[PDB]
Design a protein around this ligand. Structure first.
Ligand SMILES: [Ca+2]
Ligand SMILES: [Ca+2]
Lengths: 138, 149, 60
């Protein structure tokens, strides 16, 4: 929902849209993607706009982006949920504690989810900063 | 059994999770599963079969927990009388005191010994207001331990 | 007889510390399931091409 982001994602909608017709057309996604880095292809690019029946109006852009971001638990829940393991309130968690947790208990992570989860994670001094990782995840 | 079949169900998904939720819990934790349900054993659960020194060997599904709970359920739990004639023994002096030292020696040196770290912890909350003499009151300790947590 | 009674006391004691930890194992399941649900939610995002596209335009 948040207005802050309605106000940002409309700005982003202005660049993705290259030809100004007001609808993200496939040829714009290619054009901005060439203009940013290595483009996706057709397999992909066709498939992106086949996630929105009907014309990619700015309003359809908002929709799909929030019928995908809207599931997720909020900020303070994904942190109260890590502090359960952090009994002394040091707002960090030992890297092999959290890895043992995530990898082996509950609905275990597999080695790849594992590898991806810690590719960009906060670690320093053997400590995993979950207030930061949570901001990032979120 | 319908002591609580739908409650063993719950205690079991809970320990199922903590060793990977895949519909099965390690037989090493079968003991501990039954404790969350209101029962107390050891020698006994090893006979309804559970890992005898290890995490890793067998892992049991729901249907296989169901008779092991049944079989433990009417096993042997002691009483207040037992606890207090047992704890008399160590009362040299006749006022209901067993010293500090004497109490965690008779809990870790005997019976079905408890680790010297399970005995710092049971003394958490309970209160175990030790005397100046370093004596405790074994009656209290018996009562408090007895009142569940 | 005395050591058979000491074992049942040890059995009460053992039962006391599990029902205690029960309460804190019950929550940590929800905390652990929330932690894993939402990291799983994120790993998805970043592999979905509209998000990847947005993240590139997000400095420009
Ligand atoms: Ca356009
Ligand atoms: Ca399991």
């Amino acid at each position: 929902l948040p207005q802050k982001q309605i106000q940002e994602m409309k700005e982003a909608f202005s660049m993705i849209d290259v030809d100004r017709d007001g609808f993200v057309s496939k040829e714009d996604i290619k054009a901005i993607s060439e203009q940013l880095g290595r483009a996706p292809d057709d397999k992909e690019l066709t498939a992106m706009l086949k996630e929105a029946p009907g014309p990619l109006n700015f309003t359809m852009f908002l929709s799909i982006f929030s019928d995908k971001l809207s599931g997720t638990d909020s900020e303070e829940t994904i942190r109260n949920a890590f502090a359960m393991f952090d009994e002394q309130e040091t707002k960090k968690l030992n890297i092999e504690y959290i890895k043992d947790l995530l990898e082996n208990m509950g609905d275990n992570f597999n080695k790849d989810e594992m590898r991806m989860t810690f590719k960009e994670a906060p670690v320093e001094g053997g400590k995993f900063d979950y207030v930061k990782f949570t901001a990032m995840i979120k | 059994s319908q002591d609580e079949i739908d409650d063993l169900k719950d205690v079991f998904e809970l320990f199922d999770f903590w060793d990977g939720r895949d519909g099965a819990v390690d037989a090493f934790k079968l003991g501990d599963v039954c404790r969350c349900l209101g029962i107390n054993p050891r020698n006994e659960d090893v006979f309804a079969v559970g890992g005898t020194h290890k995490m890793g060997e067998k892992s049991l599904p729901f249907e296989e927990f169901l008779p092991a709970y049944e079989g433990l359920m009417d096993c042997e739990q002691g009483t207040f009388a037992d606890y207090m004639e047992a704890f008399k023994t160590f009362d040299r002096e006749g006022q209901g005191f067993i010293s500090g030292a004497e109490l965690r020696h008779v809990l870790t040196a005997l019976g079905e010994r408890l680790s010297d770290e399970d005995v710092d912890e049971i003394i958490k909350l309970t209160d175990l207001q030790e005397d100046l003499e370093g004596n405790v009151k074994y009656e209290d300790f018996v009562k408090k331990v007895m009142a569940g947590p | 007889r005395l050591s058979k009674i000491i074992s049942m006391f040890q059995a009460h004691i053992r039962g006391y510390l599990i029902r205690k930890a029960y309460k804190k194992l019950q929550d940590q399941r929800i905390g652990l399931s929330v932690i894993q649900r939402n990291i799983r939610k994120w790993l998805v995002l970043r592999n979905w091409q509209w998000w990847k596209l947005y993240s590139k335009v997000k400095p420009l």
